[PDB]
Amino acid sequence: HMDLGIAGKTALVCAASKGLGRGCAEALAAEGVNLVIVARTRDTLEETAEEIRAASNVSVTAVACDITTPDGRAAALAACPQPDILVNNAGGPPPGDFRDFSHDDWIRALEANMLTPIELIRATVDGMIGRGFGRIVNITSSAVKAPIDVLALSNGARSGLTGFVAGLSRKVAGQGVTINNLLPGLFDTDRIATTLAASAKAQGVTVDELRARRAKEIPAGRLGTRAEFGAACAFLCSVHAGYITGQNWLLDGGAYPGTF
């Protein structure tokens, strides 16, 4: 079986008490990576930390903070000053029409889903370079490959992060650091349960009916799972992915129709 070669390393995993971030944390812990996990809500984060500790043989430190604020980033970096692995993630922006998005709505989305990842990279990449090993994985969205009609804030902010990452990945590649993006299609998380319920109500169908329709519309016929998302993250973080950088890995069951 495949030794990812990262046992004993340390990962800062953002926005990881639930969903895709949690799947990444669990996958890294299963490969022996010590974790600092961040989310805003203490009780949920502490329960996730307990669950990961019990199922793995690694240290798990929970930091309850808002990763999109200076104080939150300072708290995360105080707990994890020199990570080998950084998984960037935060809550996504709200849906709507851009006629309703103030300058401050745009700034909030840019801060959460573009500038916060850039700042955490700025704070951690030189330590990785100095050690000759680093892995940075940004959780973005299929929206960067095909815009989502109601998510202009994501289409914009996450494409901005993607362009920045394209440049930085190539600049730091000679020092054993890779920077890649993981782009989820439709994944079976609590966030999607909330979205589907609101969409089903607006459409006059049941949420179970809408979920089944959305699954059938995806070529694979199902939603993605946090476990398989985390497995791809773990592979990117491994000693077997050192020649992969600046890449946008789309996990979507074939939903995006572009050849590239």
Ligand SMILES: NC(=O)[C@H]1CN([C@@H]2O[C@H](COP(=O)(O)OP(=O)(O)OC[C@H]3O[C@@H](n4cnc5c(N)ncnc54)[C@H](OP(=O)(O)O)[C@@H]3O)[C@@H](O)[C@H]2O)CC[C@@H]1[P+](CCC(=O)O)(CCC(=O)O)CCC(=O)O
């Ligand atoms: N599932 C999914 O399908 C997706 C998830 N997405 C993003 O990936 C992040 C994680 O998303 P997911 O893991 O699903 O969210 P979940 O709620 O389960 O977990 C969140 C954890 O983050 C903690 N947390 C939140 N905020 C902070 C903070 N400020 N500080 C610290 N921790 C924080 C929180 O904890 P708290 O802080 O305590 O609240 C939880 O621990 C996310 O950016 C999402 O947008 C990417 C793609 C898809 P799409 C459908 C794409 C297609 O169809 O092709 C497009 C979304 C977009 O383009 O924007 C969802 C569409 C919709 O939503 O209608």
